[PDB]
A paper describes a structure:
We decided to mutate His216 and His247 individually to alanine in order to abrogate the binding of tartrate or citrate at the active site and impair catalysis too. Indeed, when we solved the crystal structure of the H247A variant, it showed the absence of citrate or tartrate electron densities within the active site and the protein only assumed the open conformation, which was fortuitous for efforts toward solving the structure of the enzyme complexes with substrate analogs. In the uncomplexed H247A variant, two water molecules (Wat-1 and Wat-2) occupy the active site. Because Wat-1 and Wat-2 were essentially equidistant from Zn2+ (2.9 Å and 2.7 Å, respectively), we could not establish which should be the hydrolytic-water molecule. However, the crystal structure of the H247A variant in complex with the substrate clearly showed that Wat-2 was replaced by the incoming substrates, concluding that Wat-1 is the hydrolytic water that attacks the scissile carbonyl group of substrates. The distance between Wat-1 and Zn2+ decreases from 2.7 Å in the uncomplexed H247A variant to 2.6 Å in the complexed one.
Residue numbers in the entry: 20 to 274
The structure:
């Protein structure tokens, strides 16, 4: 198989006698295929930055092992060269400490796997607008990726209602550095949707939210280039192309 860096793929496996799916010593969780009782699914994601050239997964069964090889593709992302090199910034301590603390909190959430579906059918887009900055736009130094856009930006004047892309449980609902006023929703199976730069947050941590329910108003909080909605998806432990993920997910789970 082949997979572009920064995208997710739904792996299909036989359910009968399946025991576990491993990359190296890391276990990959599985869930039911909604349409074929004899199959299960797993989400495999490649990181955008510094992905391996090739991946070998192993599905262990009661009396056989199945090897799955995935070649990494560079894709056709937009990219521009940086001419500074030292993307090493020097924030003051108070900002450094806040960034570190919010990173620890987020990583605990994104690795807290919910082994059931909290979603309800297909994902919807969180507002009926258009993309102004696509996922995966990169800045490179000597053909090494220094940074990239980890979600997709929708056009939105300040105060535009933002709706949950699918049902789930709110895990983050506060102002964070970089992300500004942020909402993050657990949809189950390690799938998280992200809504950044809001001007108003209308949900609370722990709230059960339904697909299409208001979660806040768009804004420009934490955003340099003016008002917009930044929409992200994390799945298989990595940020992935959100519109690509939604298309692949909906092809399987569509109502
Ligand atoms: Zn963005």
């Amino acid at each position: 198989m082949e997979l572009i860096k920064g995208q997710a793929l739904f792996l299909e496996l036989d359910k009968k006698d399946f025991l576990s799916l491993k990359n190296n010593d890391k276990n990959i969780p599985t869930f039911a295929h909604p349409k074929n009782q004899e199959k299960i699914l797993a989400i495999f994601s490649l990181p955008y930055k510094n992905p391996p050239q090739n991946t070998k997964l192993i599905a262990f069964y009661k009396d056989k092992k199945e090897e799955i090889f995935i070649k990494t593709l560079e894709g056709n992302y937009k990219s521009e060269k940086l001419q500074v090199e030292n993307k090493k910034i020097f924030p003051p301590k108070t900002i450094q400490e806040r960034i570190a603390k919010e990173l620890k909190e987020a990583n605990a959430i994104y690795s807290s796997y919910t082994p059931k579906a909290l979603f309800n059918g297909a994902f919807n887009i969180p507002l009926n607008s258009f993309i102004t900055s696509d996922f995966g736009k990169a800045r490179t130094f000597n053909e090494k990726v220094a940074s990239y856009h980890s979600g997709t930006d929708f056009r939105a004047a300040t105060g535009t209602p933002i709706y949950a892309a699918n049902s789930g449980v709110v895990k983050i609902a506060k102002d964070r550095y970089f992300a500004g006023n942020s909402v993050v929703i657990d949809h189950g199976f390690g799938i998280y949707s992200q809504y950044y730069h809001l001007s108003k947050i209308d949900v609370k941590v722990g709230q059960k939210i339904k697909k299409g329910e208001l979660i806040g108003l768009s804004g420009a909080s934490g955003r340099v280039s003016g008002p917009a909605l930044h929409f992200g998806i994390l799945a298989g432990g990595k940020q992935v192309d959100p519109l690509d993920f939604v298309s692949k997910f909906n092809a399987i789970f569509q109502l």
